[PDB]
Amino acid sequence: LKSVHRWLSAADQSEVVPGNDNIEYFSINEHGRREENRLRLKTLLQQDVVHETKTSTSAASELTAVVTINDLLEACQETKPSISTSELVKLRGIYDRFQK
């Protein structure tokens, strides 16, 4: 998870191929609510076929899953059992001699 978050911290933005959010003319708003965004999106989708299922953003390698000490010591302290273990040393005590 730490390696993934470091890798995600490298992949943390659209480093290449930003959105082509060019703005055309401010159309003469005699009517309507200047909702140009939907028409622009429909036009660009029709003209470019952005979903042609071939292009990719590829802002990072999708590889090079580096691993390192750097975060391993976040082991900190384990919430282990056997902090008190009298039951389990009595478990050994059953086999103190070879019996059973």
């Binding site: 993934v4 429909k42 979903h51």
Partner: protein, 159 residues
């Protein structure tokens, strides 16, 4: 040509290129078990009806049958319920509750289990880390009936 050839009616038929093939592809289509033919024919009927509606010397006659996204939406929603025996459900039983991830920390974490396998952090291996599937105590008394539907519509695609 395939949409036309069987209608002997002289007035041609077409869609118009403001259609969103992408918005059909998932939101309109879900699991639907082919026979999309049924969809397109259901639309073609309804579009023809409004054409013959205006044909009664109404304000104008566009001289072609023109399909529209609204009739596709109506058609697909009908196709999910005319098959009334079907156990399934539409994708959008949710309104005003669009995944308000800032309303609390827990809402700020439901998105983890969907955003990750959406591959936005990585094209995951599909073969290592166990999935962070959620087992929701949530708000124990009431909420849950809504909760899953709310996220499912707004950051996912079916229910």
């Amino acid at each position: 040509h395939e949409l036309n050839r069987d209608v002997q009616q002289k007035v041609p038929v077409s869609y118009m290129d403001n259609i969103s093939f992408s918005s059909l592809s998932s939101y309109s289509a879900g699991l639907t078990p082919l026979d999309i033919k049924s969809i397109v024919e259901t639309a073609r009927m309804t579009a023809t009806a409004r054409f013959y509606q205006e044909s009664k010397k109404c304000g104008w006659l566009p001289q072609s049958i023109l399909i529209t996204q609204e009739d596709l939406s109506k058609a697909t929603s009908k196709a999910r319920n005319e098959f009334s025996v079907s156990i399934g459900a539409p994708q959008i039983p949710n309104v005003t509750w669009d995944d308000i991830g800032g309303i609390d920390f827990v809402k700020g974490e439901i998105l983890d289990t969907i955003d990750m396998p959406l591959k936005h952090p990585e094209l995951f291996t599909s073969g290592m880390k166990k999935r962070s599937g959620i087992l929701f105590y949530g708000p124990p008394g009431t909420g849950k009936t809504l909760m899953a539907k709310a996220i499912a519509t707004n950051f996912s695609l079916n229910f």
